[PDB]
Design a protein around this ligand. Structure first.
Ligand SMILES: Nc1ccn([C@@H]2O[C@H](COP(=O)(O)O)[C@@H](O)[C@H]2O)c(=O)n1
Length: 377
């Protein structure tokens, strides 16, 4: 019998966690691996060192039918070690479960490892504040059973359904915020139900790698020597962090780009509401999917040092290269940032994201700043 490891994520944070998993397990050159990480391209000089290494496109938050061609190459008993984005877990596993239906005698699910998309899960859970969570859990388990038995998806509570995987498989959840599950009292039945099936995302993992693995990991995440040297300058630093919109609406993307540029000006200009001081070196950490929103900043700002957008902010924490101050639009990156490094967090326009951050003490009780409430400088 054979284990096949699948690394699946259309987003950013779960993929970053999974690249660490790959690094920790990188000595085994023959272990079958299937990478479905949309935002990441494993360098060819790494692929070359591995056999039984496979790549699958994601479409509509699920591996395409090309997954089946890969799995067909392993005609014996196979156990699937699946790494998943939590918010998209139901769709991402969908084709794996379809394949299993057709190959009942040889395909099993060994275990799930699940990682937060990021703030998304917490914003979603916040919207469930007024529900009987204990009862939502039981209904979600029942409906998960219907899914596993019929292949059909129908959840009364899609959000709670994300957390009932243990009723079917050995699972481990990796949470951006374990504090949220403790502090949100309405969620106490969920914390109790999840028992010993969860842990916090471990940001000390990198410090524990061998020098060789640390180098390997940095290559995976794109943290090159040029970027490292730019952050090793001996001057106090501010990193302005970008956001993106999922709206494939051009007018919305253009509005975001404009508001974000104006927000940067509020941090960096002396007359800005959020003025940080003249002594800072200014950096830009665009959102991985900002695209033309990122370009807008670089084309329209000055005296700013770009940090390549696909480099996850959290890599700076691992490498001990965090700046003095960080500011920009509310982001998953702010959940693991030391409090002393927050300049200001700004929201796009009872806001559940605001509520999430307030519950966690990431922001205080003062009036939140939305970016449409900032004067155009
Ligand atoms: N400016 C940004 C925004 C996001 N990100 C990465 O993408 C993830 C999800 O962030 P968002 O919640 O902003 O979509 C983060 O945890 C961070 O790794 C980044 O590296 N730089």
């Amino acid at each position: 019998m054979k284990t096949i490891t699948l690394y699946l994520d259309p987003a950013s944070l779960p993929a970053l966690n999974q690249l660490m998993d790959f690094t920790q397990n990188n000595e085994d050159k023959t272990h079958p691996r299937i990478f479905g990480l949309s935002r990441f391209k494993i360098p060819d000089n790494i692929i070359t060192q591995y056999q039984n290494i496979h790549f699958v496109e994601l479409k509509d938050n699920r591996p395409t039918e090309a997954l089946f061609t890969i799995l067909d190459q392993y005609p014996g008993n196979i156990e699937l070690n699946i790494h998943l984005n939590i918010a998209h877990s139901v769709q991402l596993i969908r084709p794996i479960l379809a394949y299993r239906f057709k190959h009942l005698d040889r395909v099993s699910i060994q275990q799930l490892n699940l990682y937060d998309n990021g703030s998304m899960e917490y914003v979603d859970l916040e919207k469930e504040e007024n529900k009987d969570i204990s009862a939502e859990i039981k209904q979600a388990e029942k409906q998960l059973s219907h899914y596993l038995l019929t292949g059909k998806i129908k959840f009364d509570n899609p959000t709670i359904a994300r957390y009932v995987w243990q009723s079917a498989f050995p699972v481990k959840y990796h949470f951006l915020s374990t504090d949220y599950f403790e502090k949100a009292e309405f969620l106490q039945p969920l914390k109790e139900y999840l028992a010993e099936n969860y842990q916090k995302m471990d940001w000390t993992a990198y410090q524990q790698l061998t020098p060789e693995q640390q180098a390997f990991y940095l290559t995976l995440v794109g943290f090159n020597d040029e970027v490292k040297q730019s952050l090793e300058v001996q001057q106090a630093k501010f990193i302005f962090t970008g956001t993106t919109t999922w709206e494939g609406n051009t007018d919305v993307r253009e509005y975001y780009a404009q508001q974000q540029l104006n927000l940067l000006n509020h941090f960096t200009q002396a007359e800005g509401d959020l003025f940080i001081g003249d002594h800072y070196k200014i950096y830009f950490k665009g959102h991985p999917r900002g695209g033309e929103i990122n370009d807008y900043i670089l084309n329209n700002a000055k005296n700013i040092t770009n940090i390549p957008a696909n480099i996850s902010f959290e890599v700076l924490m691992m490498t001990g290269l965090l700046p003095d101050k960080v500011g920009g639009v509310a982001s998953s990156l702010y959940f693991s940032l030391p409090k002393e490094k927050i300049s200001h967090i700004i929201f796009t326009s009872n806001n559940p994201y605001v509520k999430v951050m307030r519950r966690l003490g990431i922001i205080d009780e003062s009036q939140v700043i939305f970016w449409d409430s900032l004067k155009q400088l």
